[PDB]
């Protein structure tokens, strides 16, 4: 951990270390120009530091230059020759140990991320990149998220996409699949979703996907971070060419924006893929990651380590990393893996730094309550959401109430006939806010509640239903599935959909498919071709939400003012959104979630001449008390016209 004489007697573990070496510059890394390249490395506990230069990604050094000790724990060096096309690493001696690492501020790397690449990053911008414009977004509750893996999207043999498994595969328009159905980008833009959330597209570890063996089967979600500030090599057409993955990701984002879609990056700042080998511990051992009392890794992540976001240089790394994805790649939002492992101060400064640039940039995360050496009152989780204004959190209470518990596989939920889940559904209809009485969750405002019944984790909705409806036919399970999706899209808050949920995606019952083959993980376009009715259904639900601002209320005060739950029997939920809620064109809406297969009659509130808006196929009678008779599991939406 180092010669503790170099750092004023104070160890990397004492609390007086932090305020000592707080570098105030935003110039860490290397800045290339033809005249010179300047390097700055933060490594306060090292005795020596060298820049090592390479001509080829897997060559031997051509120069090995010593760096000068500089201010606030940093080392500098200027090289007064055109270093374009060169690769480099940092070699440091920490105590009596030498290690050679990639630059933590690497913005480009060679294959598998072991050497930093020097290049003019403005040569990676696609044509017109400076003219890139974002689709409008007035409120987070106006977003419809679609969670997608780059490999899943196109790797099925019948996807009809040329660059299968690649960033460029999501740039291709006009692709067709079995029976000529639209696939890929056209299928996604055809749905009406507004944001594509991509599973890890930063550079994840070689042990997960080896970028030199892409000619053999491979698959991994990528939750194993290696280089935080550069794209994953296996999604490029050429992982050996350091510029290719950058240019190709930018082409992807530019095209999505041009087609009306925004891009959310799944980011993992809570843990690295290997606390022993990552560059953080090579360069400053004992700083960037969290430690138990015995100076072993705190392991709240169940992955091996935790990043010490609360320490100032690590908070600065995370924030400069995010601002890099925003500024260099034009990213529109971030989903924070295990946000409950990150401290509140870091999350709020992130929200602030983004708001300074563009408040429509999204920040959502997993606010789970989880043990770690990070103090309980400092965790950015649902318990502390009052301290995290404007940050959305996955609403697991809503998820479990709708489809049934994710950990006990056979337990039913509201859609599958379970008893007593109506209040759980109502709590998420209200956007997870403090609505009143028993109707309360963690959110202060509905922008803090992300509604979902499916994501990449755990069984798919279809697979969950299959595990918990032993006496249900296939048609019955389809109706349950459809009802679950309708609840997400008609609840206050931020609706979130899993790619392929529109065609009842299955993983053959695999619960945790993170390294399962493409046969398990691909978007199955043959299944999608067999489920075009259900895709149309999902497309129409998304259109219904878009056509009604009353479903997207911006504040908890509006929800408390305009949302009212109505008389309804067990296994149903009924509510109204009254008096042009949020400027809705209709005067009132009435919404019915029916989980009963049979027929039933409801007395509608006396709000005016009701008219059908959605789900007419379930309506046996609508008569002006005013009466509605329906049959079958699903949603019915009525309106009192203006």
Ligand X SMILES: OC[C@H]1O[C@H](O[C@H]2[C@H](O)[C@@H](O)[C@@H](O[C@H]3[C@H](O)[C@@H](O)[C@@H](O)O[C@@H]3CO)O[C@@H]2CO)[C@H](O)[C@@H](O)[C@@H]1O
- Interacting span for Ca ion (CB under 5 A) from 38-46, 329-337, 388-396, 397-405: 388-396
- Interacting span for Ca ion (CB under 5 A) from 118-126, 232-240, 320-328, 424-432: 232-240
Place of tokens 């749905």: 191
Rank residues 439 and 444 by Cβ distance to Ca ion and give the closer one: 444
Per rule CB under 6 A, is residue 302 in the interface with ligand X? yes
Q: Which two tokens stand for residue 269?
A: 């700042």
Q: How many residues bind ligand X (CB under 6 A)?
A: 27
Q: Please tell me the distance from the alpha carbon of residue 93 to that of residue 96, in angstroms, as a whole number.
A: 7
* 35 annotated as a binding-site residue: no
- Interacting span for ligand X (CB under 6 A) from 39-47, 187-195, 496-504, 608-616: 608-616
Cβ neighbours of residue 30 under 8 Å, at least 6 residues apart? Answer: 37, 38, 39, 40, 88, 103, 105, 116, 118
Per rule CB under 5 A, is residue 348 in the interface with Ca ion? no
* 204 annotated as a binding-site residue: yes
Rank residues 404 and 615 by Cβ distance to ligand X and give the closer one: 615
Closest distance of CB 117 from Ca ion, Å: 14
Find residue 393's DSSP bridge partners. Answer: 365, 449
Choose from ligand X, Ca ion, none: what does 304 bind? Cβ within 5-8 Å by kind.
ligand X
Choose from Ca ion, ligand X, none: what does 215 bind? Cβ within 5-8 Å by kind.
none
Nearest to 447 by CA among 487, 495, 390, 396: 390
Closest distance of CB 241 from Ca ion, Å: 14
Per rule CB under 6 A, is residue 396 in the interface with ligand X? yes
Choose from ligand X, Ca ion, none: what does 396 bind? Cβ within 5-8 Å by kind.
ligand X
Find residue 496's DSSP bridge partners. Answer: 145
Q: Please tell me the distance from the alpha carbon of residue 243 to that of residue 121, in angstroms, as a whole number.
A: 8
Cβ neighbours of residue 132 under 8 Å, at least 6 residues apart? Answer: 253, 254, 257, 330
* 405 annotated as a binding-site residue: no
Per rule CB under 6 A, is residue 366 in the interface with ligand X? yes
Per rule CB under 6 A, is residue 337 in the interface with ligand X? yes
Maximum pairwise Cα distance, the chain: 88
Place of tokens 């913005």: 107
Q: Which backbone phi and psi does 235 adopt, to 5 degrees?
A: -90, 0
Q: How many residues bind Ca ion (CB under 5 A)?
A: 4
* 457 annotated as a binding-site residue: no
Per rule CB under 6 A, is residue 221 in the interface with ligand X? yes
Closest distance of CB 515 from Ca ion, Å: 14
Rank residues 42 and 614 by Cβ distance to ligand X and give the closer one: 614
Q: What is the footprint of ligand X within residues 422-481 (CB under 6 A)? A: 457-458
Q: How many CA atoms are closer than 13 Å to the CA of 135, on its beta-carbon side?
A: 23
Rank residues 328 and 534 by Cβ distance to ligand X and give the closer one: 534
Cβ neighbours of residue 148 under 8 Å, at least 6 residues apart? Answer: 188, 196, 197, 198, 199, 499
Question: CA–CA distance from 190 to each of 261, 262, 356, 535, 620 (Å)?
Answer: 11, 15, 33, 10, 31
Q: Please tell me the distance from the alpha carbon of residue 230 to that of residue 561, in angstroms, as a whole number.
A: 46
Q: Please tell me the distance from the alpha carbon of residue 466 to that of residue 472, in angstroms, as a whole number.
A: 9
Per rule CB under 6 A, is residue 238 in the interface with ligand X? no
Per rule CB under 6 A, is residue 21 in the interface with ligand X? no
Q: What is the footprint of Ca ion within residues 248-277 (CB under 5 A)? A: none
Nearest to 516 by CA among 475, 579, 580, 459: 459
* 452 annotated as a binding-site residue: no
Q: Please tell me the distance from the alpha carbon of residue 549 to that of residue 212, in angstroms, as a whole number.
A: 49
- Interacting span for ligand X (CB under 6 A) from 89-97, 139-147, 442-450, 610-618: 610-618
Q: Please tell me the distance from the alpha carbon of residue 102 to that of residue 205, in angstroms, as a whole number.
A: 13
Q: What is the footprint of ligand X within residues 114-133 (CB under 6 A)? A: none
Q: Please tell me the distance from the alpha carbon of residue 315 to that of residue 342, in angstroms, as a whole number.
A: 9
Out of 135, 178, 190, 304, the only residue in the binding site for ligand X (CB under 6 A) is 304
Rank residues 368 and 565 by Cβ distance to ligand X and give the closer one: 368
- Interacting span for ligand X (CB under 6 A) from 16-24, 530-538, 559-567, 582-590: 530-538
Choose from ligand X, Ca ion, none: what does 179 bind? Cβ within 5-8 Å by kind.
none
Choose from ligand X, Ca ion, none: what does 409 bind? Cβ within 5-8 Å by kind.
none
Per rule CB under 6 A, is residue 269 in the interface with ligand X? no
Per rule CB under 5 A, is residue 203 in the interface with Ca ion? yes
Q: If you write DSSP's letter for every residue of 478-534 in order, what string do you get?
A: HHHHHHHHHHHHTSSSEEEEETTGGGT---TT-S--TT--HHHHS--HHHHHHTHHH
Q: What is the footprint of ligand X within residues 611-640 (CB under 6 A)? A: 614-617
Rank residues 245 and 571 by Cβ distance to Ca ion and give the closer one: 245
- Interacting span for ligand X (CB under 6 A) from 137-145, 240-248, 349-357, 532-540: 532-540
Closest distance of CB 390 from Ca ion, Å: 3
Q: Please tell me the distance from the alpha carbon of residue 422 to that of residue 566, in angstroms, as a whole number.
A: 12
Where are any strands of DSSP class E within 169-231? 195-198, 202-204, 225-231
Q: If you write DSSP's letter for every residue of 216-257 in order, what string do you get?
A: S-------SEEEEEEE-GGGSS-TTSTTHHHHHHHHHHHHHH
Per rule CB under 6 A, is residue 147 in the interface with ligand X? no
Choose from ligand X, Ca ion, none: what does 203 bind? Cβ within 5-8 Å by kind.
Ca ion
Closest distance of CB 431 from Ca ion, Å: 15
Rank residues 152 and 586 by Cβ distance to Ca ion and give the closer one: 152
Q: Please tell me the distance from the alpha carbon of residue 101 to that of residue 97, in angstroms, as a whole number.
A: 13
Per rule CB under 5 A, is residue 390 in the interface with Ca ion? yes
Contact positions vs ligand X (CB under 6 A): 221, 223-224, 301-304, 337-338, 366, 368, 370, 396, 406-407, 457-458, 512, 514, 533, 536-537, 540, 614-617
Residues annotated as binding site? 203-204, 211, 232, 466
Contact positions vs Ca ion (CB under 5 A): 203, 232-233, 390
Residues annotated as binding site for Ca(2+)? 203-204, 211, 232, 466
């Amino acid at each position: 951990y180092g010669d503790v004489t170099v750092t004023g007697g104070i160890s990397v573990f004492d609390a007086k270390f932090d305020e000592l070496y707080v570098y105030d510059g935003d110039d860490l890394g290397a800045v290339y120009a033809p005249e010179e390249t300047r390097f700055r490395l933060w490594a306060p506990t090292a005795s020596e530091a060298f820049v090592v230069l390479y001509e080829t990604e897997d060559g031997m050094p051509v120069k090995e230059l010593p760096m000068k000790r500089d201010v606030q724990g940093t080392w500098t060096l200027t090289v007064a020759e055109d270093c374009g096309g060169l690769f480099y690493t940092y070699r440091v001696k920490v105590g009596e140990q030498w290690n050679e690492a990639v630059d933590p501020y690497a913005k480009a790397v060679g294959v598998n991320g072991t050497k930093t690449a020097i290049l003019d990053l403005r040569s990676t911008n696609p044509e017109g990149w400076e003219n890139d414009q974002k689709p409008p977004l007035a409120s987070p509750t106006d977003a419809v998220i679609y969670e997608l893996h780059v490999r899943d999207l196109s790797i099925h043999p019948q996807s009809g996409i040329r660059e299968k498994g690649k960033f460029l595969g999501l740039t291709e328009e006009g692709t067709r699949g079995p029976n000529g159905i639209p696939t890929g980008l056209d299928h996604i833009t055809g749905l009406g979703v507004t944001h594509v959330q991509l599973l890890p597209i930063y550079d994840y570890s070689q042990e997960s996907v080896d970028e030199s063996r892409l000619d053999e089967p491979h698959y991994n979600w990528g939750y194993d971070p290696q280089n935080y500030n550069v794209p994953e090599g296996s999604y490029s057409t050429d992982p050996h060419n350091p510029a290719a993955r950058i240019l190709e990701l930018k082409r992807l984002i530019q095209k999505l924006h041009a087609r009306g879609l925004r891009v959310i990056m799944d980011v993992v700042y809570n843990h690295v893929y290997d606390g022993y080998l990552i560059h953080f511990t090579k360069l400053v051992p004992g700083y960037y990651l969290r430690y138990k009392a015995d100076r072993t890794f705190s392991d709240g992540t169940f992955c091996g380590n935790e990043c010490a976001s609360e320490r100032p240089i690590m908070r600065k790394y995370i924030i400069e990393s995010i601002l890099h994805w925003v500024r260099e790649y034009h990213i529109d939002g971030f989903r924070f893996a295990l946000m409950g492992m990150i401290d509140i101060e870091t999350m709020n400064e992130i929200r602030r730094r983004l708001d300074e640039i563009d408040p429509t940039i999204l920040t959502i995360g997993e606010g789970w309550m989880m043990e770690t050496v990070l103090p309980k009152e400092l965790r950015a989780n649902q318990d502390n959401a009052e301290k995290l204004p404007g940050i959305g959190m996955f609403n697991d209470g809503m998820r479990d109430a709708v489809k049934g518990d994710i950990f006990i596989f056979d337990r039913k939920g509201f859609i599958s006939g379970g008893d007593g889940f109506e209040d759980g559904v109502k709590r998420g209809v209200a956007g997870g806010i403090n609505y009143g009485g028993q109707l309360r969750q963690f959110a202060v405002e509905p922008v803090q509640s992300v509604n979902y019944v499916e994501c990449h984790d755990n069984h798919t909705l279809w697979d969950k239903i299959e595990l918990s409806t032993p006496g249900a036919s296939d048609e019955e399970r389809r109706a349950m599935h459809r009802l679950a999706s309708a609840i997400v899209l008609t609840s206050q808050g931020i609706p979130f959909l899993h790619a392929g949920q529109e065609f009842m995606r299955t993983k053959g019952g695999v619960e945790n498919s993170y390294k399962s083959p493409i046969e398990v993980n691909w978007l199955d376009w043959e299944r999608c071709a067999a489920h075009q009715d259900d895709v149309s259904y999902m497309r129409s639900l998304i259109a219904l939400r878009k056509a009604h601002p009353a479903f997207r209320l911006k504040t908890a005060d509006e929800i408390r003012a305009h949302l009212r739950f109505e008389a309804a029997p067990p296994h149903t939920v009924a509510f109204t959104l009254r008096d042009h809620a949020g400027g809705d064109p209709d005067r009132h809406l009435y919404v019915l979630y029916n989980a009963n297969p049979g027929a039933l009659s409801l007395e509608l509130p006396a709000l005016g001449p009701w008219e059908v808006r959605f789900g007419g196929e379930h309506v046996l009678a609508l008569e002006a008390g005013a009466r509605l008779e329906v049959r079958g599991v699903g949603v019915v939406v009525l309106a009192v016209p203006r």
